[PDB]
Amino acid sequence: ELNTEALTRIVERLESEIIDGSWIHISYEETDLEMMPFLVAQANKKYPELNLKFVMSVHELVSSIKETRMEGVESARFLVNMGSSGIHISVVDFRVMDGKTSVILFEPAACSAFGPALALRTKAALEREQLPDCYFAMVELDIQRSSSECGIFSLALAKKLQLEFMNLVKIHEDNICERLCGEEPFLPSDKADRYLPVSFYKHTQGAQRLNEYVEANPAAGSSIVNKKNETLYERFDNNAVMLNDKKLSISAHKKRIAEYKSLLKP
Numbered sequence: 405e406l407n408t409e410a411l412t413r414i415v416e417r418l419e420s421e422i423i424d425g426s427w428i429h430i431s432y433e434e435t436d437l438e439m440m441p442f443l444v445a446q447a448n449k450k451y452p453e454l455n456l457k458f459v460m461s462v463h464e465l466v467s468s469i470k471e472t473r474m475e476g477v478e479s480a481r482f483l484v485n486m487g488s489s490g491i492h493i494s495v496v497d498f499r500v501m502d503g504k505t506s507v508i509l510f511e512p513a514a515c516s517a518f519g520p521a522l523a524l525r526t527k528a529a530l531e532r533e534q535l536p537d538c539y540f541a542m543v544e545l546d547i548q549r550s551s552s553e554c555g556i557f558s559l560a561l562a563k564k565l566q567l568e569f570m571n572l573v574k575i576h577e578d579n580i581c582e583r584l585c586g587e588e589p590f591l592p593s594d595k596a597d598r599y600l601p602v603s604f605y606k607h608t609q610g611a612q613r614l615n616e617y618v619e620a621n622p623a624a625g626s627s628i629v630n631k632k633n634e635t636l637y638e639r640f641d642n643n644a645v646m647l648n649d650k651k652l653s654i655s656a657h658k659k660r661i662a663e664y665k666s667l668l669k670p
């Protein structure tokens with residue numbers, strides 16, 4: 405029941421809000437949530453091996469993780485709204501390897517505040533489903549800094565989790581062998597940079613944050629990240645804006661527009 409008329413009006417507002425600069429203090433979470441079923445359906449059609457599911461609670465996630473394992477599926481992703489009275493959409497990567505099940509929750513933003521608690525909450529929720537040889541880990545990325553782009557980041561990462569399948573074997577392997585987080589509750593960002601490929605950081609909202617990634621991956625600076633033959637750095641600049649003498653990235657905001665426009669295309 406996609407209301408194309410309404411969506412078309414929305415797309416124009418998004419572009420307008422970028423030009424007048426009001427985008428920064430507007431929340432797009434509610435609209436992302438509403439559009440997500442269509443956006444997920446769109447992603448799956450584009451990538452049949454993606455196996456993306458949209459779940460609207462932690463309970464629906466862990467019970468879906470149980471289902472997916474039961475059906476013999478070995479590779480899947482989940483967009484999960486973890487919030488109750490609010491919206492917080494994260495992405496989970498699911499991978500069975502050898503006999504053991506790997507579940508990794510990726511948080512696009514930081515986790516310094518209540519990271520440990522939330523990680524333990526989600527871990528325990530999954531333990532209650534009682535999956536044998538099931539290992540869980542939560543990963544901090546700290547690449548989202550904008551206020552309402554959790555959905556876009558998670559949707560984009562979901563598709564990258566598929567495309568970077570082989571590059572993500574190691575982090576899943578270390579999760580299973582319990583060599584990933586160890587003593588620490590979740591995986592901090594600096595540790596994550598050593599595991600994850602360049603394509604995950606295309607929408608990074610912070611020049612300093614990118615400098616931290618390339619310090620862990622020297623070649624990442626001058627690596628082509630798209631068909632427009634622009635490097636990670638070159639792309640970061642080509643999707644930035646000036647507001648009050650501060651360089652900000654509207655990459656994720658532009659990605660929302662791309663995602664919405666694709667639903668309109670026949």
Ligand SMILES: O=P(O)(O)O[C@H]1[C@@H](OP(=O)(O)O)[C@@H](OP(=O)(O)O)[C@@H](OP(=O)(O)O)[C@@H](OP(=O)(O)O)[C@@H]1OP(=O)(O)O
Binds near residue numbers: 606629
């Ligand atoms: O990696 P692909 O699956 O081949 O598709 C990518 C991707 O789009 P998806 O997110 O839908 O997969 C890029 O999006 P992001 O990496 O930014 O998230 C998009 O845009 P970019 O220019 O920013 O990379 C890029 O376009 P292109 O390579 O033409 O520049 C290209 O989309 P296409 O598959 O339609 O080409």
